[PDB]
Amino acid sequence: SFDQQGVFVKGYAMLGVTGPDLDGQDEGESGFYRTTFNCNELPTDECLWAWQKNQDIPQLTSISWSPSSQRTEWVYVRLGYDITQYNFFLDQTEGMTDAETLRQRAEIRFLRALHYWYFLDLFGKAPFKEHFSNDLPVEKKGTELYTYIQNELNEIEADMYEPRQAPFGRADKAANWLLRARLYLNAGVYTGQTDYAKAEEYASKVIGSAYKLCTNYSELFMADNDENENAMQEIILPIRQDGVKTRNYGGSTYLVCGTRVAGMPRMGTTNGWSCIFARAAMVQKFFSNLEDVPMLPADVEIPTKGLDTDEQIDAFDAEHGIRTEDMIKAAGDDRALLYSGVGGGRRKIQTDAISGFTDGLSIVKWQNYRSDGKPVSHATYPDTDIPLFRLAEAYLTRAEAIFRQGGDATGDINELRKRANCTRKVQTVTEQELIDEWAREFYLEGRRRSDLVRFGMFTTNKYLWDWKGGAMNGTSVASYYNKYPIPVSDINNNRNMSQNEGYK
Ligand SMILES: OC[C@H]1O[C@H](O[C@H]2[C@H](O)[C@@H](O)[C@@H](O[C@H]3[C@H](O)[C@@H](O)[C@H](O)O[C@@H]3CO)O[C@@H]2CO)[C@H](O)[C@@H](O)[C@@H]1O
Ligand SMILES: [Ca+2]
């Protein structure tokens, strides 16, 4: 019958791997991480999908999707399915009072609350169901959904592990506080009423916990981030990932293999999909003047022989100051983990036509190499865990909250820039400085869109980036695009759901 341990483990496993699956989906495409990541990244200023022919990619890239959007449905169906599983577990263990089950239920309610946030943040409403049954989910709009989420988190806190006391991979009170802080920071968006004071309060609780910032930014996204204390100390909520276990159906697989192509030095994998690369605007977060970006001159030819090894590739790049470490030095920021070297071919910073992977610089933030230099478990699938929740979010969140209230946010911003060994310290905080910092600190971590919406820059002219709105130099779009549409399939199946404003 009911396998409490098995169902509990699946609850967390759903965050980082696929068994919710739909026709037209390749390996692991229904994934919770991939679907949510694409909805918050592909339409942003952080990256571009190289294969514009793939279905619905042009729509997501340009922010011009419709209710029939395949990717919108993929993430909608996944978020919903996951919740049905959390409701199943909670119903099957109702009434149990043993210590572990109390923690398990608290954590499951946490995961459910997290999924509703995604619904809230992405659709502004959600197909709501508290229990597992055949009854059609009822629609729960913004503010009501907001209050429900905040209440869930407030009530389970007591039964959750203390900060850094839960097995690595499970959520604790700090994960609860960080999420509430996120809800508060976006309260104005979801309710129409801001609550920056509360955002600061909880961000502070997190900062006050045992969690500390990793001293080496890159280590947070490496194969051993679940064994390297320096990294573990900052990862409040990691999605466990292991080469031989998760294999090709995980999230970090998408992050590492997806941003690489044969020829690049230290691929960390045998299969580079050459799918994800940065938009010119992303590069600009580290180089206000794109002319300062280390690049191979056009008049310099790329040898067709003598560049088959990492050793040969690094030397050629070094000769021309285009190794990623040179990129970091030119940027004066440890987070400028970009690659403009010759590995994989001549790169462009900006393009006037999305034709291929090389039309932009490569992003090497995610790596399948251990900081301790020891062997990883697999040659193709990465061991790198996805640090979904990081202490750094608390700092940027409180920084913005403080700024929004009219206070001095310089301290929290310089705390992250200092950790990143930035040569430039922020003297005064501004809206632009903040939103740019969110990009620098969390780019390619699946949250960009949400931040852009809050700053009122996602659909508007307040901020134009390359390829935004389908225009090469960037153009605005209808404001109703700040919320994805309700998949037309669910509109036809659940008479309780109503389409979001704007869509037809
Ligand atoms: O290798 C030549 C092929 O290059 C292009 O295929 C792309 C896909 O379009 C892109 O989505 C990605 O596919 C991966 C897929 O998304 C993932 O679910 C699966 O598990 O791995 C796939 C990669 O093996 O990357 C591939 C390869 O770059 C092109 O569209 C295709 O027609 C070419 O045959
Ligand atoms: Ca791991």
Coordinates of N, CA and C in Angstrom, one line a residue, residues 264-471:
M264 N 35.0 23.5 -27.0 CA 35.2 24.3 -25.9 C 36.1 23.7 -24.9
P265 N 37.0 24.4 -24.2 CA 37.8 23.8 -23.2 C 37.1 23.4 -21.9
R266 N 37.4 22.3 -21.3 CA 36.8 21.9 -20.1 C 35.3 21.8 -20.2
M267 N 34.8 21.0 -21.1 CA 33.3 20.9 -21.3 C 32.7 20.2 -20.1
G268 N 33.4 19.3 -19.4 CA 32.9 18.6 -18.2 C 31.9 17.6 -18.7
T269 N 31.7 17.4 -20.0 CA 30.7 16.5 -20.5 C 31.1 16.1 -21.9
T270 N 30.7 14.9 -22.3 CA 30.9 14.3 -23.7 C 29.9 14.8 -24.7
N271 N 28.8 15.4 -24.2 CA 27.8 15.9 -25.1 C 27.3 17.3 -24.9
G272 N 27.8 18.2 -25.7 CA 27.4 19.6 -25.6 C 26.3 19.8 -26.6
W273 N 25.1 20.3 -26.1 CA 24.0 20.5 -27.0 C 24.0 21.8 -27.7
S274 N 24.9 22.7 -27.3 CA 25.0 24.0 -28.0 C 23.6 24.6 -28.1
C275 N 22.9 24.8 -27.0 CA 21.6 25.4 -27.0 C 21.4 26.7 -26.4
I276 N 22.2 26.9 -25.3 CA 22.1 28.2 -24.5 C 23.3 29.0 -24.5
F277 N 23.1 30.3 -24.9 CA 24.2 31.2 -24.9 C 23.7 32.6 -24.5
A278 N 24.6 33.5 -24.0 CA 24.1 34.8 -23.5 C 23.8 35.8 -24.6
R279 N 22.8 36.7 -24.2 CA 22.4 37.8 -25.1 C 23.4 38.9 -24.9
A280 N 23.6 39.8 -25.9 CA 24.5 40.9 -25.7 C 24.3 41.6 -24.4
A281 N 23.0 41.8 -24.1 CA 22.6 42.6 -22.9 C 23.2 41.9 -21.6
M282 N 23.3 40.6 -21.6 CA 23.8 39.8 -20.5 C 25.2 40.2 -20.3
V283 N 26.0 40.1 -21.4 CA 27.4 40.4 -21.3 C 27.6 41.9 -20.8
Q284 N 26.7 42.7 -21.1 CA 26.7 44.1 -20.6 C 26.6 44.4 -19.2
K285 N 26.1 43.4 -18.4 CA 25.9 43.5 -17.0 C 27.3 43.5 -16.4
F286 N 28.3 42.9 -17.0 CA 29.7 42.9 -16.5 C 30.5 44.0 -17.2
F287 N 30.1 44.3 -18.5 CA 30.9 45.3 -19.3 C 29.9 46.4 -19.8
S288 N 29.7 47.4 -19.0 CA 28.8 48.5 -19.5 C 29.1 48.9 -20.9
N289 N 30.4 48.9 -21.2 CA 30.8 49.2 -22.6 C 31.3 47.9 -23.2
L290 N 30.4 47.4 -24.1 CA 30.7 46.1 -24.8 C 32.0 46.1 -25.6
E291 N 32.6 47.2 -25.8 CA 33.9 47.3 -26.5 C 35.0 46.8 -25.6
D292 N 34.8 46.8 -24.3 CA 35.8 46.4 -23.3 C 35.8 44.9 -23.1
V293 N 34.9 44.2 -23.8 CA 34.8 42.7 -23.7 C 35.9 42.1 -24.5
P294 N 36.7 41.2 -23.8 CA 37.8 40.5 -24.5 C 37.3 39.7 -25.7
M295 N 37.8 40.1 -26.9 CA 37.4 39.4 -28.1 C 38.5 39.2 -29.1
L296 N 38.3 38.1 -29.9 CA 39.3 37.8 -30.9 C 39.0 38.8 -32.0
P297 N 40.1 39.5 -32.5 CA 39.8 40.5 -33.6 C 39.4 39.8 -34.8
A298 N 38.5 40.4 -35.6 CA 38.0 39.8 -36.8 C 39.1 39.5 -37.8
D299 N 40.1 40.4 -37.9 CA 41.3 40.2 -38.8 C 42.2 39.1 -38.4
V300 N 42.0 38.5 -37.3 CA 42.8 37.4 -36.8 C 42.1 36.1 -37.2
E301 N 42.8 35.3 -38.0 CA 42.2 34.0 -38.4 C 42.3 32.9 -37.4
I302 N 41.4 32.0 -37.4 CA 41.3 30.9 -36.5 C 41.9 29.7 -37.1
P303 N 43.1 29.3 -36.7 CA 43.7 28.1 -37.3 C 42.8 26.9 -37.4
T304 N 42.9 26.2 -38.5 CA 42.0 25.0 -38.7 C 42.7 23.8 -38.3
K305 N 43.9 23.9 -37.8 CA 44.7 22.8 -37.3 C 45.5 23.2 -36.0
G306 N 45.6 22.3 -35.1 CA 46.4 22.6 -33.9 C 45.6 23.2 -32.7
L307 N 44.3 22.9 -32.7 CA 43.4 23.3 -31.6 C 42.5 22.2 -31.3
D308 N 43.0 21.0 -31.0 CA 42.2 19.8 -30.7 C 42.2 19.5 -29.2
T309 N 43.1 20.1 -28.5 CA 43.2 19.8 -27.1 C 42.9 21.0 -26.2
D310 N 42.5 20.8 -25.0 CA 42.2 21.9 -24.1 C 43.5 22.7 -23.9
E311 N 44.6 22.1 -23.9 CA 45.9 22.7 -23.7 C 46.2 23.6 -24.9
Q312 N 46.0 23.2 -26.1 CA 46.2 24.0 -27.3 C 45.2 25.2 -27.4
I313 N 43.9 24.9 -27.0 CA 42.9 25.9 -27.0 C 43.2 27.0 -26.0
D314 N 43.5 26.7 -24.8 CA 43.8 27.7 -23.8 C 45.0 28.6 -24.1
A315 N 46.0 28.0 -24.8 CA 47.2 28.8 -25.2 C 46.8 29.8 -26.2
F316 N 46.0 29.4 -27.2 CA 45.6 30.3 -28.3 C 44.8 31.5 -27.7
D317 N 43.8 31.1 -26.8 CA 43.0 32.1 -26.2 C 43.8 33.0 -25.3
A318 N 44.8 32.5 -24.5 CA 45.6 33.2 -23.7 C 46.4 34.2 -24.5
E319 N 46.9 33.7 -25.6 CA 47.7 34.6 -26.6 C 46.9 35.8 -26.9
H320 N 45.5 35.6 -27.0 CA 44.6 36.7 -27.4 C 43.8 37.2 -26.2
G321 N 44.1 36.9 -25.0 CA 43.4 37.3 -23.8 C 41.9 37.0 -23.8
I322 N 41.6 35.8 -24.4 CA 40.2 35.4 -24.4 C 39.8 34.1 -23.7
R323 N 40.6 33.7 -22.7 CA 40.3 32.6 -21.9 C 39.3 33.1 -20.9
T324 N 38.4 32.3 -20.3 CA 37.4 32.7 -19.4 C 38.1 33.5 -18.2
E325 N 39.2 33.0 -17.8 CA 39.9 33.7 -16.7 C 40.3 35.1 -17.1
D326 N 40.5 35.3 -18.4 CA 40.9 36.7 -18.8 C 39.6 37.5 -18.8
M327 N 38.5 36.9 -19.2 CA 37.2 37.5 -19.2 C 36.9 38.0 -17.8
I328 N 37.2 37.2 -16.8 CA 37.0 37.5 -15.4 C 37.8 38.7 -14.9
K329 N 39.1 38.7 -15.4 CA 40.0 39.8 -15.0 C 39.6 41.1 -15.7
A330 N 39.2 41.0 -17.0 CA 38.8 42.2 -17.7 C 37.5 42.8 -17.0
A331 N 36.7 41.9 -16.5 CA 35.4 42.3 -15.9 C 35.6 42.8 -14.5
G332 N 36.7 42.3 -13.8 CA 36.9 42.6 -12.4 C 35.7 42.1 -11.6
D333 N 35.2 41.0 -11.9 CA 34.1 40.3 -11.2 C 34.2 38.8 -11.4
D334 N 34.3 38.1 -10.3 CA 34.4 36.6 -10.4 C 33.2 35.9 -11.1
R335 N 32.1 36.6 -11.2 CA 30.9 36.1 -11.8 C 30.8 36.2 -13.3
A336 N 31.8 36.9 -13.9 CA 31.8 37.0 -15.3 C 32.3 35.7 -16.0
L337 N 31.6 34.6 -15.7 CA 31.9 33.3 -16.2 C 31.4 33.1 -17.6
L338 N 32.0 33.9 -18.5 CA 31.6 33.8 -19.9 C 32.8 33.3 -20.8
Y339 N 32.6 32.9 -22.0 CA 33.6 32.4 -22.9 C 33.5 33.0 -24.3
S340 N 34.6 33.7 -24.7 CA 34.6 34.3 -26.0 C 35.8 33.7 -26.8
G341 N 36.4 32.6 -26.2 CA 37.5 32.0 -26.9 C 37.2 31.3 -28.2
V342 N 38.2 30.7 -28.8 CA 38.0 30.1 -30.1 C 37.4 28.7 -30.0
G343 N 37.4 28.1 -28.8 CA 36.9 26.8 -28.6 C 35.4 26.7 -29.1
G344 N 35.1 26.0 -30.2 CA 33.8 25.9 -30.6 C 33.5 26.9 -31.8
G345 N 34.5 27.7 -32.1 CA 34.3 28.6 -33.3 C 34.3 30.1 -32.9
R346 N 34.3 31.0 -33.9 CA 34.3 32.4 -33.6 C 33.0 32.9 -33.0
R347 N 33.1 33.6 -31.9 CA 31.9 34.1 -31.3 C 31.5 35.5 -31.6
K348 N 30.3 35.9 -31.4 CA 29.8 37.2 -31.6 C 29.3 37.7 -30.2
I349 N 29.2 39.0 -30.0 CA 28.6 39.4 -28.7 C 27.2 39.7 -29.0
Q350 N 26.9 40.2 -30.1 CA 25.5 40.5 -30.6 C 25.4 40.1 -32.0
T351 N 24.1 39.7 -32.4 CA 23.9 39.2 -33.7 C 22.7 39.9 -34.3
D352 N 22.5 39.9 -35.6 CA 21.4 40.6 -36.2 C 20.5 39.5 -36.8
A353 N 20.7 38.3 -36.3 CA 19.9 37.2 -36.7 C 20.3 36.0 -35.9
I354 N 19.3 35.4 -35.2 CA 19.6 34.2 -34.3 C 19.8 33.0 -35.2
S355 N 21.0 32.8 -35.7 CA 21.2 31.6 -36.5 C 21.9 30.5 -35.8
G356 N 22.8 30.7 -34.9 CA 23.4 29.6 -34.2 C 24.0 29.9 -32.8
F357 N 24.4 28.8 -32.2 CA 25.0 28.9 -30.8 C 26.1 29.9 -30.6
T358 N 26.9 30.1 -31.7 CA 28.0 31.0 -31.6 C 27.6 32.5 -31.8
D359 N 26.3 32.8 -32.0 CA 25.9 34.1 -32.2 C 25.9 35.0 -30.9
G360 N 26.5 34.3 -29.9 CA 26.6 35.0 -28.6 C 27.7 34.4 -27.8
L361 N 28.2 35.0 -26.7 CA 29.2 34.4 -25.9 C 28.6 33.2 -25.2
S362 N 29.5 32.2 -24.8 CA 29.0 31.1 -24.1 C 29.0 31.4 -22.6
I363 N 28.1 30.7 -21.9 CA 28.1 30.9 -20.4 C 28.6 29.6 -19.8
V364 N 29.7 29.7 -19.0 CA 30.3 28.6 -18.4 C 30.2 28.6 -16.9
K365 N 29.1 29.3 -16.4 CA 28.8 29.4 -15.0 C 28.6 28.0 -14.3
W366 N 27.9 27.1 -15.0 CA 27.7 25.7 -14.5 C 28.7 24.8 -15.0
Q367 N 29.4 24.1 -14.1 CA 30.4 23.1 -14.5 C 30.3 21.8 -13.8
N368 N 30.7 20.7 -14.5 CA 30.8 19.4 -14.0 C 32.2 19.0 -13.6
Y369 N 32.8 19.8 -12.9 CA 34.2 19.6 -12.3 C 34.2 19.9 -10.9
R370 N 34.8 19.1 -10.1 CA 34.9 19.3 -8.6 C 36.0 20.2 -8.3
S371 N 35.7 21.1 -7.3 CA 36.7 22.0 -6.8 C 37.9 21.3 -6.2
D372 N 37.7 20.1 -5.7 CA 38.8 19.4 -5.1 C 39.6 18.6 -6.1
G373 N 39.2 18.7 -7.4 CA 39.9 18.0 -8.4 C 39.7 16.5 -8.6
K374 N 38.8 16.0 -7.7 CA 38.6 14.5 -7.7 C 37.6 14.2 -8.9
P375 N 37.6 12.9 -9.3 CA 36.7 12.4 -10.4 C 35.2 12.6 -10.1
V376 N 34.5 12.9 -11.2 CA 33.0 13.0 -11.1 C 32.5 11.6 -11.4
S377 N 31.2 11.3 -11.1 CA 30.7 10.0 -11.3 C 30.4 9.6 -12.7
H378 N 30.2 10.5 -13.6 CA 29.9 10.2 -15.0 C 30.6 11.1 -16.0
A379 N 30.8 10.5 -17.2 CA 31.5 11.3 -18.3 C 30.5 12.2 -19.1
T380 N 29.2 12.0 -19.0 CA 28.3 12.7 -19.8 C 27.3 13.5 -18.9
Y381 N 26.7 12.9 -17.9 CA 25.7 13.5 -17.0 C 26.5 14.0 -15.8
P382 N 26.2 15.3 -15.4 CA 26.9 16.0 -14.3 C 26.4 15.6 -12.9
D383 N 27.3 15.8 -11.9 CA 27.0 15.6 -10.5 C 26.5 16.9 -9.9
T384 N 26.8 18.0 -10.5 CA 26.5 19.3 -10.0 C 25.0 19.5 -9.5
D385 N 24.8 19.8 -8.3 CA 23.5 20.0 -7.7 C 23.1 21.5 -8.1
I386 N 21.8 21.7 -8.2 CA 21.3 23.0 -8.5 C 21.0 23.7 -7.2
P387 N 21.8 24.7 -6.8 CA 21.5 25.4 -5.6 C 20.3 26.4 -5.7
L388 N 19.1 25.8 -5.8 CA 17.9 26.6 -6.0 C 17.8 27.8 -5.1
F389 N 18.1 27.6 -3.8 CA 18.0 28.6 -2.8 C 19.4 28.9 -2.3
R390 N 19.9 30.1 -2.4 CA 21.2 30.5 -1.9 C 21.2 31.7 -1.0
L391 N 22.0 31.8 0.0 CA 22.0 32.8 1.0 C 22.1 34.2 0.3
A392 N 22.8 34.3 -0.9 CA 22.9 35.5 -1.6 C 21.6 36.2 -1.9
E393 N 20.5 35.4 -2.0 CA 19.2 35.9 -2.3 C 18.8 36.8 -1.2
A394 N 19.0 36.4 0.0 CA 18.7 37.2 1.2 C 19.3 38.6 1.1
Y395 N 20.6 38.6 0.8 CA 21.3 39.9 0.7 C 20.8 40.8 -0.4
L396 N 20.5 40.3 -1.6 CA 20.0 41.2 -2.6 C 18.6 41.6 -2.3
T397 N 17.8 40.7 -1.7 CA 16.4 40.9 -1.4 C 16.3 42.0 -0.3
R398 N 17.1 42.0 0.7 CA 17.1 43.0 1.8 C 17.6 44.3 1.2
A399 N 18.6 44.2 0.3 CA 19.2 45.4 -0.3 C 18.1 46.1 -1.1
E400 N 17.3 45.4 -1.9 CA 16.2 46.0 -2.7 C 15.2 46.6 -1.7
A401 N 14.8 45.7 -0.7 CA 13.8 46.1 0.2 C 14.1 47.4 0.9
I402 N 15.4 47.5 1.4 CA 15.9 48.7 2.1 C 15.9 49.8 1.1
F403 N 16.4 49.6 -0.1 CA 16.4 50.7 -1.1 C 15.0 51.2 -1.3
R404 N 14.0 50.3 -1.6 CA 12.6 50.7 -1.8 C 12.0 51.5 -0.7
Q405 N 12.5 51.3 0.5 CA 12.0 52.1 1.6 C 12.7 53.4 1.8
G406 N 13.7 53.6 1.1 CA 14.5 54.8 1.1 C 15.7 54.8 2.0
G407 N 16.2 53.6 2.3 CA 17.4 53.4 3.1 C 18.7 53.2 2.4
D408 N 19.8 53.0 3.1 CA 21.1 52.8 2.5 C 21.3 51.3 2.3
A409 N 21.2 50.9 1.0 CA 21.4 49.5 0.6 C 22.8 49.1 0.2
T410 N 23.7 50.1 0.2 CA 25.1 49.8 -0.2 C 25.8 48.6 0.4
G411 N 25.6 48.5 1.7 CA 26.2 47.4 2.5 C 25.8 46.0 2.0
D412 N 24.6 45.7 1.7 CA 24.2 44.4 1.3 C 24.6 44.1 -0.2
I413 N 24.7 45.2 -1.0 CA 25.1 45.0 -2.4 C 26.7 44.7 -2.4
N414 N 27.4 45.5 -1.6 CA 28.9 45.4 -1.6 C 29.3 44.1 -0.9
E415 N 28.3 43.5 -0.2 CA 28.6 42.2 0.5 C 28.8 41.1 -0.6
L416 N 28.0 41.2 -1.6 CA 28.0 40.2 -2.7 C 29.1 40.5 -3.7
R417 N 29.4 41.8 -3.9 CA 30.4 42.3 -4.9 C 31.8 42.0 -4.2
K418 N 31.8 42.1 -2.9 CA 33.1 41.8 -2.2 C 33.4 40.3 -2.3
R419 N 32.3 39.5 -2.1 CA 32.5 38.1 -2.2 C 33.0 37.7 -3.6
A420 N 32.6 38.4 -4.6 CA 32.9 38.2 -5.9 C 34.2 38.9 -6.3
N421 N 34.9 39.5 -5.3 CA 36.2 40.2 -5.6 C 36.0 41.3 -6.6
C422 N 34.9 41.9 -6.7 CA 34.7 43.0 -7.6 C 35.6 44.2 -7.4
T423 N 36.2 44.7 -8.4 CA 37.1 45.8 -8.4 C 36.3 47.1 -8.2
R424 N 35.0 47.1 -8.6 CA 34.2 48.3 -8.5 C 33.1 48.1 -7.4
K425 N 33.2 49.0 -6.4 CA 32.2 48.9 -5.3 C 31.1 49.9 -5.6
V426 N 29.9 49.6 -5.2 CA 28.7 50.5 -5.4 C 28.8 51.5 -4.3
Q427 N 28.8 52.8 -4.7 CA 28.8 53.9 -3.8 C 27.4 54.3 -3.4
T428 N 26.5 54.3 -4.4 CA 25.1 54.6 -4.2 C 24.3 53.6 -5.0
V429 N 23.1 53.2 -4.4 CA 22.3 52.2 -5.0 C 21.2 52.9 -5.8
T430 N 20.9 52.3 -7.0 CA 19.9 52.9 -7.8 C 19.1 51.7 -8.4
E431 N 17.9 52.0 -9.0 CA 17.1 50.9 -9.5 C 17.9 50.1 -10.5
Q432 N 18.6 50.8 -11.4 CA 19.4 50.1 -12.4 C 20.5 49.2 -11.8
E433 N 21.2 49.8 -10.8 CA 22.2 49.0 -10.1 C 21.7 47.7 -9.5
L434 N 20.5 47.8 -8.9 CA 19.9 46.6 -8.3 C 19.6 45.5 -9.3
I435 N 18.8 45.9 -10.3 CA 18.4 45.0 -11.3 C 19.5 44.4 -12.1
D436 N 20.6 45.1 -12.2 CA 21.8 44.7 -12.9 C 22.5 43.7 -12.0
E437 N 22.5 44.0 -10.7 CA 23.1 43.1 -9.8 C 22.4 41.7 -9.7
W438 N 21.1 41.8 -9.8 CA 20.3 40.5 -9.7 C 20.7 39.6 -10.9
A439 N 21.0 40.3 -12.1 CA 21.5 39.5 -13.2 C 22.8 38.9 -13.0
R440 N 23.8 39.8 -12.5 CA 25.1 39.3 -12.2 C 25.2 38.2 -11.2
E441 N 24.4 38.3 -10.1 CA 24.5 37.3 -9.1 C 23.7 36.0 -9.4
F442 N 22.6 36.1 -10.0 CA 21.7 34.9 -10.3 C 21.5 34.6 -11.8
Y443 N 22.2 35.2 -12.7 CA 21.9 34.8 -14.1 C 21.9 33.3 -14.3
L444 N 21.0 32.9 -15.2 CA 20.9 31.4 -15.5 C 20.6 30.6 -14.3
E445 N 19.8 31.1 -13.3 CA 19.4 30.4 -12.2 C 17.8 30.3 -12.2
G446 N 17.2 30.6 -13.3 CA 15.8 30.5 -13.5 C 14.9 31.5 -12.8
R447 N 15.3 32.7 -12.5 CA 14.5 33.7 -11.8 C 14.4 35.1 -12.5
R448 N 15.2 35.3 -13.5 CA 15.3 36.6 -14.2 C 13.9 37.3 -14.5
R449 N 13.0 36.6 -15.2 CA 11.7 37.1 -15.5 C 11.0 37.7 -14.3
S450 N 10.9 37.0 -13.2 CA 10.2 37.5 -12.1 C 10.8 38.8 -11.6
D451 N 12.1 38.9 -11.6 CA 12.7 40.1 -11.1 C 12.5 41.3 -12.1
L452 N 12.5 41.0 -13.4 CA 12.2 42.0 -14.4 C 10.8 42.6 -14.3
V453 N 9.8 41.7 -14.0 CA 8.4 42.1 -13.8 C 8.3 43.1 -12.7
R454 N 8.9 42.7 -11.5 CA 8.8 43.5 -10.3 C 9.4 44.9 -10.6
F455 N 10.5 45.0 -11.3 CA 11.1 46.3 -11.7 C 10.4 46.9 -12.8
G456 N 9.3 46.3 -13.3 CA 8.5 46.9 -14.4 C 9.4 47.1 -15.7
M457 N 10.2 46.1 -16.0 CA 11.1 46.1 -17.1 C 10.9 44.9 -18.1
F458 N 10.1 44.0 -17.7 CA 9.9 42.8 -18.5 C 9.3 43.0 -19.9
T459 N 8.2 43.7 -19.9 CA 7.4 44.0 -21.2 C 7.6 45.4 -21.7
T460 N 7.9 46.4 -20.8 CA 7.9 47.8 -21.1 C 9.2 48.3 -21.8
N461 N 9.2 49.6 -22.1 CA 10.3 50.3 -22.7 C 11.3 50.8 -21.6
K462 N 11.0 50.5 -20.4 CA 11.9 50.9 -19.3 C 13.2 50.2 -19.5
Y463 N 13.2 49.1 -20.2 CA 14.5 48.4 -20.5 C 14.4 47.6 -21.7
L464 N 15.2 47.9 -22.7 CA 15.2 47.1 -24.0 C 16.5 46.4 -24.1
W465 N 16.4 45.1 -24.5 CA 17.6 44.3 -24.7 C 17.6 43.7 -26.0
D466 N 18.7 43.2 -26.5 CA 18.7 42.6 -27.9 C 17.7 41.4 -28.0
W467 N 16.9 41.5 -29.1 CA 15.9 40.5 -29.5 C 14.7 40.5 -28.6
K468 N 14.6 41.5 -27.8 CA 13.3 41.6 -27.0 C 12.2 42.0 -27.9
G469 N 11.0 41.4 -27.7 CA 9.9 41.7 -28.5 C 10.0 41.3 -30.0
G470 N 11.0 40.5 -30.3 CA 11.2 40.0 -31.6 C 12.1 41.0 -32.5
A471 N 12.4 42.1 -31.9 CA 13.2 43.1 -32.7 C 14.7 42.9 -32.3

